[PDB]
Enzyme design. Structure first.
Site, PDB file in Angstrom:
ATOM      1  N   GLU A 263       5.346  14.038  11.499  1.00 34.50           N
ATOM      2  CA  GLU A 263       6.012  12.767  11.800  1.00 34.50           C
ATOM      3  C   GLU A 263       7.514  12.996  11.773  1.00 34.50           C
ATOM      4  O   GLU A 263       8.029  13.482  10.754  1.00 34.50           O
ATOM      5  CB  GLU A 263       5.649  11.668  10.789  1.00 34.50           C
ATOM      6  CG  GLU A 263       4.188  11.232  10.729  1.00 34.50           C
ATOM      7  CD  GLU A 263       3.914   9.876  11.380  1.00 34.50           C
ATOM      8  OE1 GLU A 263       2.811   9.328  11.157  1.00 34.50           O
ATOM      9  OE2 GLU A 263       4.790   9.354  12.108  1.00 34.50           O
ATOM     10  N   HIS A 282       3.597   4.728  14.609  1.00 34.93           N
ATOM     11  CA  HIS A 282       3.543   4.422  13.177  1.00 34.93           C
ATOM     12  C   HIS A 282       4.076   3.014  12.906  1.00 34.93           C
ATOM     13  O   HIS A 282       5.009   2.797  12.126  1.00 34.93           O
ATOM     14  CB  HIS A 282       4.300   5.472  12.346  1.00 34.93           C
ATOM     15  CG  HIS A 282       3.820   5.572  10.930  1.00 34.93           C
ATOM     16  ND1 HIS A 282       3.282   6.729  10.406  1.00 34.93           N
ATOM     17  CD2 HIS A 282       3.765   4.649   9.939  1.00 34.93           C
ATOM     18  CE1 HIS A 282       2.936   6.522   9.146  1.00 34.93           C
ATOM     19  NE2 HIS A 282       3.229   5.270   8.834  1.00 34.93           N
TER      20      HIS A 282
HETATM   21  N1  LIG Z   1      -0.152   3.362   9.521  1.00 33.77           N
HETATM   22  C1  LIG Z   1       0.616   2.625   8.529  1.00 33.77           C
HETATM   23  O1  LIG Z   1       1.653   2.081   8.844  1.00 33.77           O
HETATM   24  C2  LIG Z   1       0.047   2.491   7.119  1.00 33.77           C
HETATM   25  C3  LIG Z   1       0.422   1.440   6.323  1.00 33.77           C
HETATM   26  C4  LIG Z   1      -0.154   1.327   5.087  1.00 33.77           C
HETATM   27  C5  LIG Z   1      -1.077   2.269   4.652  1.00 33.77           C
HETATM   28  N2  LIG Z   1      -1.416   3.327   5.451  1.00 33.77           N
HETATM   29  C6  LIG Z   1      -2.317   4.251   5.072  1.00 33.77           C
HETATM   30  O2  LIG Z   1      -3.692   3.694   5.288  1.00 33.77           O
HETATM   31  C7  LIG Z   1      -4.545   4.244   4.422  1.00 33.77           C
HETATM   32  C8  LIG Z   1      -5.269   3.190   3.655  1.00 33.77           C
HETATM   33  O3  LIG Z   1      -4.369   2.438   2.884  1.00 33.77           O
HETATM   34  P1  LIG Z   1      -4.943   1.533   1.644  1.00 33.77           P
HETATM   35  O4  LIG Z   1      -3.853   0.594   1.172  1.00 33.77           O
HETATM   36  O5  LIG Z   1      -6.215   0.813   1.989  1.00 33.77           O
HETATM   37  O6  LIG Z   1      -5.203   2.669   0.448  1.00 33.77           O
HETATM   38  P2  LIG Z   1      -6.172   2.449  -0.845  1.00 33.77           P
HETATM   39  O7  LIG Z   1      -5.595   3.333  -1.935  1.00 33.77           O
HETATM   40  O8  LIG Z   1      -6.341   1.004  -1.249  1.00 33.77           O
HETATM   41  O9  LIG Z   1      -7.657   3.041  -0.421  1.00 33.77           O
HETATM   42  C9  LIG Z   1      -7.775   4.363  -0.064  1.00 33.77           C
HETATM   43  C10 LIG Z   1      -9.247   4.772  -0.231  1.00 33.77           C
HETATM   44  O10 LIG Z   1      -9.373   6.070   0.086  1.00 33.77           O
HETATM   45  C11 LIG Z   1     -10.450   6.529  -0.691  1.00 33.77           C
HETATM   46  N3  LIG Z   1     -10.736   7.929  -0.688  1.00 33.77           N
HETATM   47  C12 LIG Z   1     -10.211   8.816  -1.539  1.00 33.77           C
HETATM   48  N4  LIG Z   1     -10.763  10.012  -1.266  1.00 33.77           N
HETATM   49  C13 LIG Z   1     -11.629   9.839  -0.255  1.00 33.77           C
HETATM   50  C14 LIG Z   1     -12.461  10.697   0.413  1.00 33.77           C
HETATM   51  N5  LIG Z   1     -12.618  12.122   0.169  1.00 33.77           N
HETATM   52  N6  LIG Z   1     -13.229  10.247   1.405  1.00 33.77           N
HETATM   53  C15 LIG Z   1     -13.204   8.940   1.751  1.00 33.77           C
HETATM   54  N7  LIG Z   1     -12.389   8.089   1.087  1.00 33.77           N
HETATM   55  C16 LIG Z   1     -11.615   8.553   0.089  1.00 33.77           C
HETATM   56  C17 LIG Z   1     -10.124   6.015  -2.093  1.00 33.77           C
HETATM   57  O11 LIG Z   1     -11.300   6.032  -2.990  1.00 33.77           O
HETATM   58  C18 LIG Z   1      -9.711   4.570  -1.705  1.00 33.77           C
HETATM   59  O12 LIG Z   1     -10.750   3.702  -1.822  1.00 33.77           O
HETATM   60  C19 LIG Z   1      -3.684   5.156   3.357  1.00 33.77           C
HETATM   61  O13 LIG Z   1      -3.694   6.579   3.829  1.00 33.77           O
HETATM   62  C20 LIG Z   1      -2.302   4.536   3.506  1.00 33.77           C
HETATM   63  O14 LIG Z   1      -1.210   5.493   3.132  1.00 33.77           O
HETATM   64  C21 LIG Z   1      -0.882   3.426   6.697  1.00 33.77           C
END
Ligand SMILES: NC(=O)c1ccc[n+]([C@@H]2O[C@H](COP(=O)([O-])OP(=O)(O)OC[C@H]3O[C@@H](n4cnc5c(N)ncnc54)[C@H](O)[C@@H]3O)[C@@H](O)[C@H]2O)c1
Ligand SMILES: NC(=O)c1ccc[n+]([C@@H]2O[C@H](COP(=O)([O-])OP(=O)(O)OC[C@H]3O[C@@H](n4cnc5c(N)ncnc54)[C@H](O)[C@@H]3O)[C@@H](O)[C@H]2O)c1
Lengths: 320, 320
Positions: A263, A282
């Site tokens: 990125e 993004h």
């Molecule tokens: N594109 C964007 O602008 C943006 C914005 C916010 C969040 N995100 C990303 O989106 C994703 C989800 O965000 P969130 O707030 O729901 O996070 P969250 O922490 O609430 O949930 C993440 C989940 O991933 C799970 N996980 C961990 N290891 C795993 C594995 N081996 N296999 C499957 N699942 C597993 C965890 O148990 C958890 O339940 C994160 O990577 C976050 O950084 C992206």
């Protein structure tokens, strides 16, 4: 008293006005390295707009620097090691865009199912008669596979299972099956079953050593050739050359991608060539509403450190 | 005994197999006029794939013709007057694609809100940095104005008000306010209020003399300049030159269009020029599932007429 430097604007001006009431704020946009160096020398706090990098040279020049705040969750563009070495607090601003990313994910699932970008291009080219060769997909009754049943994965599952009447499977090794039941999904312990069953796979895991490049060529080989991949999580969850191979060789039918590795993406990314891959830069988590929440959180944490109060989201807690 | 001609394929092969079990079926695809004339001469039933026209010359040549079935709701491409004059039953096949059109409408609302086609083009052009100039819209709390609270309007209202947490207004002079309450919408008697309040206006009325060109320049002038128009209903609900003016002069922010006037659209339609108008080729109601329902209904009604049984969807009942 204190000066603060914004390396890039915040996602909403409210955080800049909040900082300006208590500190002397300077904003630089898409700056060259020499502008960062000249502007950072005497500031007490720094805000960094993703995905701009803040490196060891800049941190070394920042003689008064006490806190660095990112704009959202990701800190991979900050040289945290250099900051920790000089006792500088690094904070991020996570978890404030669940609704934004949920909506974006739905938009991408629907756009792939309804062949939105392709059919639009056909009509504008005078090929309305493409309707004799291509049909949209009806989401009702199809299977959505969610990888990561966290805040966003749960919210997407709930809408797709109830409003869109999809069958939802979820893979997440760290949640109980009851969490899936709550959002009318089924928890599956075998990722292979999610891959072979799903018509749409949407990635929402935390990025860890375990999930890094979990979507590689072997995973794409198990997916249905008719299935689509959606990634709004982190770029490193997918092995990019393997997605290129999967698209070119038709192991899967298409993809929608909001996150990249690296990125920002290079201008000649090999995925751009493929009409059945759609992109956003993004922005899944960057609506005005989510941006305002993140801007207030970033401004508040900077002010907290400058007043000797511990902020909620320290990335390098051993400095405090 | 009886021969049947399919002028274009059905939307699913099940209806062709059903007809072939009881009649001698011939299928012609995108036919020239002379092929229609040669193939129609002795058939007892005819199926017409929208928007192909069936004219008075062809009907006059069809010496044994007893029934004409369209593929879906629209019959404007059939010379019904000529059919009625010769005692030929015309049937349509309506109301079998509510879920398909509801999903398509949601896809278009979300694609406009998330600036899908524009951001995709920017990224593929190497302009990921467009994220410093353009943000997606968060649907939660925005106002959706539904024109026509029928089967599809109600289904779209219900999803947008509950799953997407939008404020939903509905204009429909022929329903009670309780119908809007059922889907967590508010019925409004003043179309002007819907126009001035809405961030997204989605058209779902029946086409009547009252709704023909109801969305003209005066209507676009009352909309918010930031608002979007979605039309999956019928092309004649919008006055096309006025939408062109509204887009070019920025009276509204964009549109998503699945239906056209005339159908099919000309190759040089002036709307194609505008990047903020997105198109699909009258496919909102044509998923495989909806196509199968419509194909079975078309086949069944043809067979009914050939056996002297009255079909459900006669368009010209005075011939029976
Ligand atoms: N594109 C964007 O602008 C943006 C914005 C916010 C969040 N995100 C990303 O989106 C994703 C989800 O965000 P969130 O707030 O729901 O996070 P969250 O922490 O609430 O949930 C993440 C989940 O991933 C799970 N996980 C961990 N290891 C795993 C594995 N081996 N296999 C499957 N699942 C597993 C965890 O148990 C958890 O339940 C994160 O990577 C976050 O950084 C992206
Ligand atoms: N794009 C496609 O492929 C496709 C497929 C199916 C239906 N359609 C079209 O979508 C539209 C909605 O279909 P439906 O099944 O929900 O029809 P419906 O008959 O169930 O509902 C139509 C509504 O329009 C309302 N209406 C009548 N006059 C009105 C007026 N002056 N102002 C506002 N509303 C008025 C009626 O009261 C009714 O409630 C129709 O035009 C239909 O032909 C398009």
């Amino acid at each position: 008293n204190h000066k603060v430097l914004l390396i890039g604007k915040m996602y909403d001006e409210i955080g800049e006005k909040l900082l300006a009431e208590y500190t002397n704020v300077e904003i630089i946009k898409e700056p060259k390295q020499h502008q960062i160096h000249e502007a950072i020398q005497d500031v007490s706090g720094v805000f960094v707009r993703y995905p701009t990098k803040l490196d060891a040279q800049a941190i070394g020049l920042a003689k008064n620097l006490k806190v660095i705040s990112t704009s959202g969750f990701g800190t991979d563009a900050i040289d945290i090691a250099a900051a920790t070495k000089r006792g500088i607090v690094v904070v991020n601003n996570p978890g404030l865009s669940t609704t934004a990313v949920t909506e974006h994910t739905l938009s991408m699932i629907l756009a792939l199912a309804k062949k939105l970008t392709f059919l639009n291009q056909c009509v504008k080219a005078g090929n309305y008669l493409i309707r004799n060769q291509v049909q949209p997909i009806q989401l009702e009754g199809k299977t959505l596979g969610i990888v990561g049943l966290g805040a966003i994965g749960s919210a997407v599952a709930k809408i797709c299972s109830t409003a869109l009447q999809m069958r939802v499977l979820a893979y997440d090794p760290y949640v109980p099956s009851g969490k899936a039941d709550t959002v009318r999904a089924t928890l599956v312990q075998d990722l292979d079953y999610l891959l072979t069953e799903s018509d749409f796979v949407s990635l929402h895991p935390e990025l860890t050593d375990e999930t890094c490049e979990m979507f590689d060529l072997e995973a794409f080989k198990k997916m249905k050739p008719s299935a689509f991949l959606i990634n709004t999580s982190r770029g490193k969850v997918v092995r990019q050359p393997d997605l290129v191979t999967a698209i070119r060789e038709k192991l899967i039918a298409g993809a929608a991608i909001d996150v990249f590795e690296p990125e920002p993406p290079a201008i000649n990314n090999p995925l751009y060539e493929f009409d059945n891959v759609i992109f956003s830069p993004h922005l899944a988590g960057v609506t005005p509403e989510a941006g305002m929440a993140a801007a207030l959180s970033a401004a508040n944490q900077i002010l907290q450190v400058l007043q000797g109060e511990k902020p909620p989201y320290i990335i390098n807690p051993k400095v405090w």
